[PDB]
């Protein structure tokens, strides 16, 4: 049920998503080991993901959360990087996309920093890098991130290093 609609670079929607991507790059404490060395991206394509069933599953749950939190879903747009983005866009997020060893327990992780999610595109710690060149800093191979609508509701605040 998923269809992908290409956005034109002239579309203000393309432009605002590109800007979120570019303006949330930061330097990482690994010196680029996981995600590569870069200060910006070459954006090649932005597609809207349309799936009626997955959308209604999301809005159903959003309403439940909202009604448990004084009518506030506390909805954010956040990045997610994964080797499984093709499965996610077709079948939705589930237990199989959890970061079992993550610092906040086994759940599905999202970042405000695009460059943080970029570190997971080829796996935890960047895996072995791109399939073709085995390079975590590959400048040739095409990468994919998701920019996702996420319902946080009442969020537990963990101060952390």
């Amino acid at each position: 049920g998923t269809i992908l609609i290409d956005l034109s670079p002239d579309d203000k929607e393309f432009q605002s998503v590109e800007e979120e991507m570019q303006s949330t790059v930061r330097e990482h404490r690994d010196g680029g080991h996981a995600g590569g060395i870069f200060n910006r991206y070459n954006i090649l394509k932005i597609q809207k993901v349309c799936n009626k069933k997955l959308w209604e599953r999301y809005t159903h749950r959003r309403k439940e959360v909202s009604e448990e939190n004084h009518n506030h879903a506390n909805e954010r747009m956040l990045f997610h990087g994964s080797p499984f983005v093709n499965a996610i866009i077709h079948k939705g997020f589930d237990e199989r996309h959890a970061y079992i060893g993550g610092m906040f327990g086994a759940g599905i992780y999202f970042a405000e920093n695009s460059s943080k999610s970029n570190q997971y595109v080829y796996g935890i710690g960047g895996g072995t890098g791109c399939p073709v060149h085995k390079d975590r800093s590959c400048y040739i191979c095409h990468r994919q991130l998701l920019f996702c609508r996420v319902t946080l509701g009442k969020s537990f605040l963990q101060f952390s290093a």
């Binding site: 070459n42 866009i89 327990g105 590959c138 009442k154 963990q158 101060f159």
Partner: protein, 47 residues
């Protein structure tokens, strides 16, 4: 998948060392996110 803390729907990981890092977030139900945009890109070699 684990459960969220009792009384909560997610976790916010607030950075408390690296002053330039933004927040990270964890949800424990797949139905609390929708993958709205697929972005295809390359990282760029600094000049």
């Amino acid at each position: 998948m684990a459960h969220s803390p009792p009384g909560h729907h997610s976790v916010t990981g607030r950075p408390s060392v690296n002053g330039l890092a933004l927040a990270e977030y964890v949800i424990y139900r797949g139905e609390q996110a929708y993958p709205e945009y697929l972005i295809t890109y390359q990282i760029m070699r600094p000049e």
